[PDB]
Subunit: 161 residues, 3 copies
């Protein structure tokens, strides 16, 4: 396996219900893969889809961190202002140590692209030796957020181990 | 009534005691009114003044969100570093979901005007279908903070419904 | 004594164990001293070193705030992503009121220097009449963070009294 095991969680009632395909997940996998060396040897080893339900989100984040030994979890979607956007709230429950600088960089860089970046309520932090980062559900958002992180994310992953 | 009901809470021991007039409140109303179309049809339907007392602030934020069906609450003042500045602490108690990107944009844009922007401890978030945003008590601050939000605030209000 | 009493806490297992010298502490003292007038009359009156242990950090922050009447506490180190970096978590337990704008400015300015700024998880806030600010353990980091704060830090200290 890879130096760093990455898992991608798509959070979406629509995808989870089989009402539409996942358009964000593949973009996230592609960005991680294509940045594998810049990330210190990262590979996406697992994906999953959950609905916009705090308990479902918490359960997968806990399992992937505590049991499956993932190193990086990216979540996609559920960070906006609608009532069903609960990804940050689930995330804040599971993380042990907050990582606000990652949020800062994502926001700073995303705002250069679109003012609608301000509507992302993404959270991020560390549980055990797993880094968890919320990204927006727009496919273009993940690539932009990863580019913002890439200069330091390899070192984040080194440090958490 | 309007598409979006806005309420403005001035937080000030001085104004509340009748020791001075409200100079921030009218500026906040003026900025919202003059931006009504950019905001998707917003109108200020109510104002109030409370002292720098956490319970008084909490009570009005809860009433306006839970009973009076306000869509946007702007608070003015009580965000600084003095012992009596408790607006953020009251706000954090009543919000259900944090909206850090709004804080980011307000800070980012305010710092371009004055380094004293860093002394604002404003909070923001959603309770029910009510968006609550703390702004500084300086009259010039509200206009600057609203300009920072205006590119996306209409969509924030659409989403929370 | 000075108008403002400053205390500097170096947080480091290595320094605390006598395994290396403190290289950050002296730089922090030097930056405060050399900025004493810009800070409104600040002087570093005390330093200490603690290990990367939440209880040890909490205890000194509480003592310096509650008993020793310090006005500004700068902590150095323990803000990164390694398991032993627990300074922010200790800090969040002791502060009463968060001061996110200080964190914003430090991050914003630090990112101009190095992308590794995003790996700082520094916290900051007020306890009583004591302002507490976490800075990174890199000696160059303290100078850069203080320069970012200096335009408004005197007024922060005036306000907290
Ligand atoms: N980099 C980046 N960030 C972004 C976007 C984007 O296109 N690029 N879309 C925004 C929009 S349009 C919103 S509504 C929020 C929240 O999205 P979410 O609910 O899908 O997670 O993310 C914002 N963040
Ligand atoms: N945009 C903007 N933000 C601003 C200001 C301003 O003039 N414009 N004044 C600052 C000052 S001088 C302080 S002390 C804090 C806190 O103000 P408050 O306590 O009145 O809420 O807001 C800051 N934020
Ligand atoms: N201004 C500034 N901030 C900075 C740095 C710096 O050199 N200058 N170093 C960074 C690095 S390399 C990391 S790993 C984090 C955390 O450092 P800490 O664990 O020593 O506190 O701070 C970051 N913040
Ligand atoms: Cu959107
Ligand atoms: Cu001020
Ligand atoms: Cu580092």
């Amino acid at each position: 396996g890879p130096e760093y095991k990455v898992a991608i969680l798509t959070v979406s009632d629509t995808v989870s219900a089989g009402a539409g395909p996942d358009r964000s997940g593949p973009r996230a996998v592609s960005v991680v893969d294509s940045s594998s060396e810049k990330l210190g040897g990262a590979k996406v080893v697992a994906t999953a889809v959950v609905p916009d339900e705090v308990e479902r989100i918490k359960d997968i984040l806990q399992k992937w961190s505590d049991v499956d030994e993932m190193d990086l979890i990216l979540t996609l979607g559920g960070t906006g202002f609608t009532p069903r956007d609960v990804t940050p709230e689930a995330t804040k429950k599971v993380i042990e140590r907050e990582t606000p600088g990652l949020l800062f960089v994502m926001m700073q860089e995303s705002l250069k692209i679109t003012p609608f970046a301000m509507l992302s309520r993404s959270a991020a932090g560390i549980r055990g030796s797993t880094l968890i980062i919320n990204m927006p559900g727009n496919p273009n958002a993940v690539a932009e957020c990863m580019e913002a992180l890439l200069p330091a994310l390899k070192h984040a992953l080194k440090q958490i181990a």
